[PDB]
Write a sequence for this structure.
């Protein structure tokens, strides 16, 4: 059977992964101690897609945790489900990253890649047939970018036959806190576009706006933002673990989703977001949800594709659903905005129907987007990088680490190719 | 008054001493590691009993998991 | 079994000697009377004392040593002390004249009629003992009575007993403090007569011992009581292997076989790491790592040897107390990787370790600390030749202008023997440099 | 019936044997007093392979204790099982060791070899027919090497038809404590090579690493090392004493283990090792055992054979297993590294399955290895030997004892012949 090995990296993915995993455990009904309480046969049958079995009826998570700062592991280990994760699984470093990409890409990773490779291949042998793997990290994160770019480069040669699912969060366009973040972003994405096949783009500003729009709760916790992105990540993974005539394999999906090889960047979408009174003020029906599914407010990934057009769209519907209401609502939206699509591809919609409703609500869905809305994203990162390389600010460090300006020259040339590429196909 | 050169027999530090002198001071207890540790962990004293405990640990759960097998089990 | 015989020549060697059994009695709890409490340890003499004391059916622990000196003044006083009942009356060999700081006078004039007496003493101890690993010689190079008299006796015990070990412990002459200008006469006289018979000679200098007292023990005016207790603690630590056990037990035979490189040179140096005041250890922590740094810290040695001016050959450490091989082997591994510590390339391995679980105890009315982890650090380096280099340029002038020669030639010696020791010393110094050259 | 008589030699073998025999008794369930408590039929019948019968159901061990230092023998005599050992078997000398190879080999041995030969032949005449003998000592040991070389030389000619099993621990590569040890080792190994047929190689540094790796217990005792090796020593001896569809005789094994006469040096390998939480975090399955027993970190003998290749491999499996899984793990590991074996011999694997598990662990195994991982060991001592023989350090004792430089000349030359012989077989 096809199983998946999870990869957690970066101090962000430290919080996403914990939230991502506890949702799954609570979804399947396993107690924090780990003794599963048999309630649903279907989730009992298909937990082995992600979890292996140990003694005592506990489902060991097949995820990999890597970082540098020990305190982060102590916190997640003291978290609600740290006991569920293995000290065997906890690999880390005797050093701090300094939020430095070059240190984590050449210096500190050098003595640590061996162990994690020895780690990941161990569970790779423990499992029989993988569809692939998925990675939680960030493009603008110090340890996450430094570690991931090394590992993804390595993981290709040993297993060039599996899925390179990458789950990365885009830092805020308006603010980056870390001032060398565009340097971290530019270096990583050069290898990322070279190495990955799929990439999720997520931004915090929209999450803040969505809280203003539908959560309406003023002061949230970052974990609640993790609760959001984990739910989106969970929904796309419900396909594999759950029955119903929807076609689940990411390869069933990705080939339907990408026209040309260098297209890896995709935009999530999710189903009813509800406020204080609207739980009892909402008639949960197909028309309203698909309306809310395709709301320019309801999106959360980067920014509005209203500036551009839609390349490919894929929709998965989770719950008691039927083909006729969806069929007409694709017809509804197709006739609603046909011109806002691209004439390059007609009927660019991909539909999957999961008959098993989620734990939390009956009618739900998830959306993944490939539109012409990524230009301004890397267009944004273009200007700062040119501005910063104009007078090489904050450069004496990486030279001491052993980096040269030449690496940047092709790297920006690589993104600028995509800028022309994304522009050329649509415009 | 000898505090200027208080060596007459030995130096005094009593006011800074709020405790006694009778015995020596060990930094910590390496025994604490020893009671925490069981030397015979490779061979616990749990003979046939734990065989049954693992025998009744939910073969059906394990069969649903990965098609478990004990003793010719279909 | 496992026992040795100690000897103490020189009134320098007596009061340092007296202290050790004053120390030795405490750890086994010997009362000043000579017997235990109603608890049972007496018998055929077979218990922790059998290696050190002779507690026969009479119940009196007889120390297996003889106090020999040429004047009663110190020894009859301790014969009126607190432990004189323990000591065998004629094991306190007293003389009636003085050797007048003269090597020859002690070696020739009075020695002839006295050594036969102590020869009777040693054989009567030889017959009663069973294992007789070796001897403990406490003496001094510039001995007013220690220097000259030791030389003849060590020859006599060597010629009749050359199959057993001899261990030498003498205060090295104070380099910049000269309590005797006849010391350079007798000291080199002692060395040349001992180079061809002595098996293992261990030295010490009082100035640094004093300098130890006020650097960390915080005593700017200590006494012998402190000084003798310090060296008494030293001999106690090395002798703990005979008394008790540990992870491994090592004997002086291994010390001899593994420390001395070649014939002639047999002069390592001892060092004890946790030499700290009580309050310091009270509000700090002790472990193997830091005391390992201190034991190899150059200022913690009691001879004016700067190790970076020399090179290391042999190094013996004896961990007494609660330790584990893990942090010990990891710490010494870091020492091998160290660049300042320059061992000779001839020895890739040079570390003789001894582990003893028993922690060293405090002494009542003492000034020491409260130690769990302790180590006596025996090591030999090439930075020691400067000591005899100091002696010879001291010597060459004082032989160039024949000072005090009329005293020595007036009693029966000539200049050839004084000449011999010089090229004998010159032989050693060229030996020291050629082993120094790799 | 074919039995074994044991010899405990050297001061290390004194601790080793004391640990080793109590493991046997507790495994068989005899109390420290010696009165066996009848619980298991199989161990009741097959105890005579090692033990003999005393009056009152007392099983006398057939071991002869030899040393020079009383305190070590008094300590083991005062142990919880010193009573089960015999004062008859306590032969010794009135001399100190000095940790000198020659004194024990020529001076101290001369007056003791007479007595020990009488004791063993009396023990030999006490029993009927041996498989052979096994010896516990060290190669770098001061006294054990001295008598160990003497005894093996003598016991060759009287009974040249039996098994010359040896169990010697290699000193620590980083430091040998004893500084004349490489002299003693080079002396010992010269006589070891022609007089032995089987050799066990053990190193404490790896054992120290094992404590850091899986035991994770910081501060063990030396005895905390002893049961570790005895369990491996017990495990290889479980096969004879216990029933099951596996061939037990060492001659079964040795002929499958030894292609050429000069191959005597063999390395141990042991099965599941567990940490603080992984007792309840481990799914005890034959794959993960086979995974773990074949781990680079799991070798404990000298070092990693990664630099070289595998000549012959033989593992004994103890517990409730089946014939098929051992095959398919054998296939898996064969496919896992097909090139890393020698083309010289295919199917270099010899498997045995003991159906009787340990008395508290069920899935277990023992591995004995012959790889091309011994070269560096004697090269290391080669520069040690050459450098010290370059300027004859510490030589005056052995000449004083009566040894001469010529003895060293062939001793290293034989080792040099062994260097190429291992090299030319593999490289
Ligand atoms: N965990 C976490 N990460 C956040 C949060 N907000 C923003 N981030 C970003 O997520 C990025 C990814 O984290 P990592 O890749 O693990 O960062 P790192 O490699 O340890 O180095 P730094 O980025 O300096 O922390 C960080 O750089 C942060 O900028 C948050 O609230 N929690
Ligand atoms: N070992 C030791 N030496 C001491 C002590 N006190 C002083 N010294 C020094 O040790 C030297 C003793 O040597 P000698 O004076 O020749 O001793 P001696 O041969 O027994 O005969 P005397 O001159 O009477 O003492 C003196 O020069 C002092 O400097 C002490 O308590 N113990
Ligand atoms: N029993 C024991 N032996 C140890 C230990 N650590 C290291 N060893 C070594 O095991 C070796 C073998 O012991 P023996 O052959 O009996 O040694 P020996 O001939 O009596 O003389 P030495 O080698 O000096 O001990 C010794 O040389 C030690 O170096 C330990 O903790 N316990």
């Amino acid at each position: 059977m096809r199983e998946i090995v999870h990869l957690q990296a970066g101090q962000c993915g430290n919080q996403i992964g914990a939230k991502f995993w506890e949702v799954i455990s609570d979804e399947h009904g396993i107690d924090p101690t780990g003794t599963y309480h048999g309630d649903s046969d279907l989730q009992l049958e298909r937990i082995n897609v992600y979890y292996n079995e140990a003694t005592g009826g506990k489902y060991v998570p097949r995820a990999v945790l890597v970082d540098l700062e020990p305190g982060t592991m102590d916190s997640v280990r003291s978290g609600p489900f740290g006991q569920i994760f293995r000290p065997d699984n906890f690999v880390f470093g005797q050093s701090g990253a300094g939020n430095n990409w070059a240190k984590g890409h050449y210096t500190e990773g050098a003595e640590l890649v061996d162990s994690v490779l020895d780690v990941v291949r161990k569970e790779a042998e423990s499992c029989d047939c993988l569809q692939g793997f998925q990675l939680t990290h960030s493009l603008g994160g110090g340890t996450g970018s430094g570690m991931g770019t090394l590992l993804i480069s390595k993981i290709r040669e040993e297993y060039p036959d599996r899925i390179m699912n990458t789950f990365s969060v885009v830092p805020s366009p308006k603010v980056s806190d870390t001032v060398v973040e565009p340097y971290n972003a530019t270096l990583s994405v050069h290898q990322l576009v070279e190495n990955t096949d799929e990439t999720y783009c997520i931004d915090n500003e929209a999450l803040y706006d969505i809280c203003f729009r539908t959560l309406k709760l003023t002061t949230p916790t970052y974990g609640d933002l993790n609760h959001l992105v984990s739910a989106t990540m969970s929904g796309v993974t419900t396909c594999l673990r759950f029955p119903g005539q929807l076609n689940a394999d990411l390869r069933k999906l990705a080939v339907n989703m990408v026209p040309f090889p260098r297209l890896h960047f995709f935009m999530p979408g999710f189903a009813p977001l509800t406020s204080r009174g609207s739980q009892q003020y909402r008639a949960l029906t197909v028309p309203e949800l698909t309306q809310q599914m395709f709301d320019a407010k309801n999106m959360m990934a980067a920014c509005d594709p209203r500036h551009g057009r839609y390349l490919t769209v894929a929709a998965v519907f989770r719950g008691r659903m039927s083909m006729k209401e969806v069929d007409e609502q694709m017809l509804n939206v197709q006739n609603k905005n046909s011109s806002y699509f691209v004439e390059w591809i007609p009927n660019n919609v991909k539909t999957a129907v999961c008959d098993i409703p989620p734990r939390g609500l009956k009618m739900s869905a998830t959306f993944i987007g490939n539109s012409t809305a990524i230009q301004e994203l890397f267009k944004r990162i273009s200007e700062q990088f040119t501005a910063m390389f104009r007078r090489k600010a904050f450069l004496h460090w990486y030279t001491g680490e052993g980096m040269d300006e030449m690496e940047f020259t092709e790297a920006e040339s690589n993104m600028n190719d995509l800028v022309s590429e994304y522009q050329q196909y649509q415009d | 008054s000898h505090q200027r050169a208080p060596l007459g027999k030995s130096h005094d530090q009593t006011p800074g001493l709020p405790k006694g002198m009778d015995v020596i001071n060990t930094t910590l207890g390496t025994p604490t590691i020893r009671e925490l540790s069981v030397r015979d962990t490779v061979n616990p004293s749990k003979s046939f009993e734990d065989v049954l405990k693992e025998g009744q640990e939910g073969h059906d759960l394990y069969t649903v998991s990965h098609n478990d097998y004990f003793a010719g089990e279909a | 079994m496992r026992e040795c015989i100690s000897i103490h020549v020189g009134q320098a060697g007596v009061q340092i000697g007296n202290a050790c059994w004053e120390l030795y009695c405490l750890e086994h709890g010997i009362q000043p009377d000579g017997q235990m409490p109603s608890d049972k340890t007496i018998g055929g003499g077979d218990d922790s004392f059998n290696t050190f004391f002779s507690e026969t059916g009479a119940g009196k622990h007889v120390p297996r040593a003889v106090f020999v000196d040429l004047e009663p003044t110190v020894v009859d006083e301790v014969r009126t002390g607190t432990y004189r009942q323990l000591f065998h009356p004629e094991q306190l060999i007293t003389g009636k004249e003085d050797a007048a700081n003269n090597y020859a006078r002690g070696h020739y004039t009075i020695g002839k009629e006295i050594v036969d007496l102590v020869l009777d003493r040693i054989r009567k101890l030889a017959d009663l003992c069973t294992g007789l690993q070796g001897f403990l010689i406490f003496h001094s190079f510039g001995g007013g009575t220690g220097s000259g008299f030791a030389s003849l006796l060590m020859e006599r015990l060597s010629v009749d007993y050359g199959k057993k070990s001899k261990l030498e412990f003498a205060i090295y002459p104070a380099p910049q403090v000269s309590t005797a200008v006849v010391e350079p006469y007798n000291s080199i006289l002692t060395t040349h007569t001992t180079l061809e018979h002595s098996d293992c000679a261990f030295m010490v200098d009082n100035e640094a011992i004093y300098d130890i007292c006020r650097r960390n023990l915080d005593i700017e005016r200590p006494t012998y009581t402190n000084l003798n207790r310090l060296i008494g603690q030293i001999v106690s630590s090395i002798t703990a292997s005979l008394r008790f056990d540990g992870a491994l037990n090592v004997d002086l035979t291994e010390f001899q076989t593994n420390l001395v490189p070649y014939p002639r040179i047999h002069f390592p140096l001892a060092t004890y790491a946790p030499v700290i005041s009580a309050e310091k250890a009270y509000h700090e922590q002790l472990s193997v790592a830091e005391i390992t740094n201190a034991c190899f810290e150059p200022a913690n040695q009691m001879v004016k040897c700067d190790p970076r001016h020399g090179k290391y050959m042999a190094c013996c450490m004896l961990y007494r107390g609660d330790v584990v091989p893990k942090d010990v082997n990891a710490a010494i591994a870091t020492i091998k990787t160290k660049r300042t510590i320059q061992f000779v390339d001839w020895c890739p391995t040079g570390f003789k370790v001894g582990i003893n679980y028993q922690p060293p105890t405090v002494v009542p009315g003492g000034d020491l600390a409260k130690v769990q982890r302790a180590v006596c650090m025996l090591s030999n380096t090439t930075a020691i030749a400067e000591a005899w280099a100091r002696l010879d340029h001291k010597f060459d002038l004082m032989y160039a202008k024949r000072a005090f020669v009329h005293w020595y030639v007036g009693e029966g010696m000539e200049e050839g023997e004084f000449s011999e020791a010089r090229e004998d010393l010159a032989a050693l110094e060229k030996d020291y440099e050629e082993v120094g050259v790799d």
Observations:
- DSSP finds 15 helices and eleven strands in chain C.
- Chains C and A do not touch (no CB pair under 8 Å).
- Residues C 10-13, 15-16, 69, 101, 140, 142-146, 171, 179-180, 224 surround guanosine-5'-triphosphate (ligand 2) (CB under 6 Å).
